[PDB]
Amino acid sequence: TKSLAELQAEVCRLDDRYLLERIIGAGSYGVVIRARDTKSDNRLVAMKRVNKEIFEEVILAKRILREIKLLAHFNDDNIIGLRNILTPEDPENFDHFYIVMDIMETDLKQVLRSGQELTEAHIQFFIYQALRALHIIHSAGVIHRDITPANILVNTNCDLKICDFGLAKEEGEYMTDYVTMRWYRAPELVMEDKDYSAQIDVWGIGCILGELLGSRPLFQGKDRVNQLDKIVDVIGTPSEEDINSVGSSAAQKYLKKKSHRPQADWRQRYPTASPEALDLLRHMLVFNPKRRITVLQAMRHPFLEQLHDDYALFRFDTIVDVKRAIYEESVKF
Numbered sequence: 040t041k042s043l044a045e046l047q048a049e050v051c052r053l054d055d056r057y058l059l060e061r062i063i064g065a066g067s068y069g070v071v072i073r074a075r076d077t078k079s080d081n082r083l084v085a086m087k088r089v090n091k092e093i094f095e096e097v098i099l100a101k102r103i104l105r106e107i108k109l110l111a112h113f114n115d116d117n118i119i120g121l122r123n124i125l126t127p128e129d130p131e132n133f134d135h136f137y138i139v140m141d142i143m144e145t146d147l148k149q150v151l152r153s154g155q156e157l158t159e160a161h162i163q164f165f166i167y168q169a170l171r172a173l174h175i176i177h178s179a180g181v182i183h184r185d186i187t188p189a190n191i192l193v194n195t196n197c198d199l200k201i202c203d204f205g206l207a208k209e210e211g212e213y214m215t216d217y218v219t220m221r222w223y224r225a226p227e228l229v230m231e232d233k234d235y236s237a238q239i240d241v242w243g244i245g246c247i248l249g250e251l252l253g254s255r256p257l258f259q260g261k262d263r264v265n266q267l268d269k270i271v272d273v274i275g276t277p278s279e280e281d282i283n284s285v286g287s288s289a290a291q292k293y294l295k296k297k298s299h300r301p302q303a304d305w306r307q308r309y310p311t312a313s314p315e316a317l318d319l320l321r322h323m324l325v326f327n328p329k330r331r332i333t334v335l336q337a338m339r340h341p342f343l344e345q346l347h348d349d350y351a352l353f354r355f356d357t358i359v360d361v362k363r364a365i366y367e368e369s370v371k372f
């Protein structure tokens with residue numbers, strides 16, 4: 040549960056294949072471990088542990104089941120792959136299980152935190168790979184809903200893979216305020232629009248693009264209303280017709296009483312950035328999702344012209360019932 044040796048003994052009781060080396064990721068409901076597969080010629084592999092707290096709530100367990108299903112559903116180079124599903128043979132012992140994925144060197148949150156220099160060529164390849172991945176996910180009728188730098192895995196080859204389908208949605212729910220990271224939520228989410236689209240993932244890419252171009256997270260809200268303030272302070276006060284197009288009645292009312300903020304100068308925010316980069320960034324971060332750039336349009340944008348090259352529908356359907364479904368996904372290996 041905690042020490043590496045304790046985790047190793049736990050994994051060995053599931054499958055003797057995997058040798059643990061070091062913990063590379065920490066989550067709210069489990070840790071991520073760098074392991075080597077002794078039967079696959081000691082190749083490096085990532086292992087994602089799911090702890091007991093997931094199987095205490097039905098909602099949480101249904102989320103993890105969908106995540107495994109989605110990982111197995113996709114077979115693409117820009118989406119993190121699924122290698123195995125380790126589950127306890129005894130239902131009386133099933134209070135945890137492991138998700139085995141391909142290994143990536145690091146992720147973007149990290150990369151940005153190191154303050155490492157990134158060229159426009161680096162950003163172009165990152166952004167296109169992320170968009171191309173989103174196009175595949177969206178074509179399968181799935182919305183990622185959690186597009187953040189931490190959920191974007193990268194190598195020194197600048198190869199990119201999207202991970203964490205833990206909050207993925209069908210292409211209308213009540214968003215929670217009890218969150219640790221709300222800085223990448225689209226304005227339609229922030230303003231409590233019950234029904235949203237795949238454009239919320241585009242917003243996340245824009246936020247990521249804003250940071251890749253040389254910046255800390257653009258919209259650092261401490262709460263929901265404050266998140267809206269941080270967004271509007273930057274992109275500027277939207278037109279009356281756009282305000283009426285997104286948000287609940289109360290959210291629209293608050294936004295109208297707010298003082299006028301002009302569209303901030305992207306050129307001043309990024310003195311070195313190309314006009315193509317600043318336009319894609321501007322269009323990705325449009326208030327109204329209906330006027331916001333789409334994934335297809337973003338892939339065809341002049342900023343990615345040297346990279347652009349001219350999927351099946353995912354079917355959505357107690358805690359014990361979820362556990363049984365997870366082992367069924369394990370049998371497939």
Ligand SMILES: Nc1ncnc2c1ncn2[C@@H]1O[C@H](COP(=O)(O)OP(=O)(O)NP(=O)(O)O)[C@@H](O)[C@H]1O
Pocket residue numbers: 063064065066067068069071085087106119140141142143144145146189190192202203204205206
């Ligand atoms: N295949 C992988 N290779 C390398 N690092 C990884 C890999 N998968 C995950 N990580 C790291 O582990 C972190 C957390 O993994 P993640 O899949 O995002 O679970 P999570 O953040 O807890 N969301 P949840 O689905 O609710 O568990 C990521 O931010 C990465 O830094």
Ligand SMILES: [Mg+2]
Pocket residue numbers: 189190203
């Ligand atoms: Mg994550």
